[PDB]
Design an enzyme around this catalytic site. Structure first.
Site, short mmCIF file in Angstrom:
data_model
loop_
_atom_site.label_atom_id
_atom_site.label_comp_id
_atom_site.label_asym_id
_atom_site.label_seq_id
_atom_site.Cartn_x
_atom_site.Cartn_y
_atom_site.Cartn_z
N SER B 9 0.90 -1.31 -0.01
CA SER B 9 -0.08 0.02 0.03
C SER B 9 0.88 1.32 0.09
CB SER B 9 -0.88 0.01 1.33
OG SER B 9 -1.62 1.38 1.31
N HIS B 10 0.26 2.43 -0.45
CA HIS B 10 0.87 3.52 0.10
C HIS B 10 1.34 3.88 1.35
CE1 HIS B 10 0.30 5.56 -3.79
NE2 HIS B 10 0.90 6.75 -3.35
N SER B 11 0.29 3.10 2.30
CA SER B 11 0.18 3.31 3.80
C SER B 11 0.98 2.31 4.40
CB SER B 11 -1.01 3.31 4.12
OG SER B 11 -1.21 3.35 5.36
N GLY B 43 3.44 6.38 0.00
CA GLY B 43 3.88 6.04 -1.50
C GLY B 43 4.20 4.64 -1.77
N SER B 70 -1.72 2.58 -7.53
CA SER B 70 -0.28 2.76 -7.48
C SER B 70 0.44 1.49 -6.87
CB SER B 70 0.11 3.90 -6.47
OG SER B 70 1.33 4.31 -6.79
#
Lengths: 132, 129
Positions: B9-11, B43, B70
């Site tokens: 994840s981005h997270s 990111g 992403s």
């Protein structure tokens, strides 16, 4: 229109992370997100009273969209419904959608749509990636 | 059989959160929290995925779970950068990140790979409609 996304999980880390991620992506400019993971003290577990209090503390002119991942989060989301006044039930929507992807889909389409049917449909469509 | 769960994840919060939640409830599965950039910001970091596969044993199935576009793109690039031998053990799982990962870690406790991914793929429905 007025919408809130309520994120239920055992993990407060998960729901805070989702809220932070969506907000930082600028995907929740037209929706309020509530991080409702964990028990009353941050422990792994779920409390339906977090949902109830959140709905009771909010304005009456919101649509409330409830996402859960698993287990007692799901149960806590169902038990909360039966605890609400009749006027409140009409504004309470259990979204049959995965937690991260459903919420993000609901959030991004509220920045595009005035239409709760479509906001609900997008989330319900969310979990897949084009994978195998 | 030997499955790793890799979480993208981005997270980092989300992937740390999912990892901690799986472990606190369930043994012999290695879970990788690969959310976030290298310094931990919001990111993607495809190198972390590639590293993870390279550092791992050769007798393991890698089940990749991602959330948004992403992380998905990043997981796909990761696969594209691997060796053909490594690519054969790398499974992009068409599942929800949280419920998908949980279903798979639970099911793996089965030796049928087809079923571990199948349960993951049909995860995330609440019976709510």
């Amino acid at each position: 229109m007025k919408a809130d996304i309520l994120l239920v999980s055992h993990s407060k880390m998960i729901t805070d992370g989702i809220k932070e991620m969506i907000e930082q992506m600028n995907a929740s400019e037209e929706i309020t997100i509530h991080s409702l993971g964990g028990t009353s003290d941050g422990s792994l577990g779920s409390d339906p009273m977090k949902i109830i209090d959140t709905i009771n503390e909010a304005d009456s002119d919101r649509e409330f969209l409830i996402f859960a991942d698993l287990g007692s989060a799901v149960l806590s989301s169902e038990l909360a419904f039966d605890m609400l006044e009749e006027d409140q039930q009409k504004h309470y929507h259990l979204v049959d959608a995965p937690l991260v992807e459903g919420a993000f889909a609901s959030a991004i389409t509220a920045g595009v749509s005035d239409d709760l049917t479509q906001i609900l449909a997008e989330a319900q469509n969310a979990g897949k990636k084009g994978w195998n």
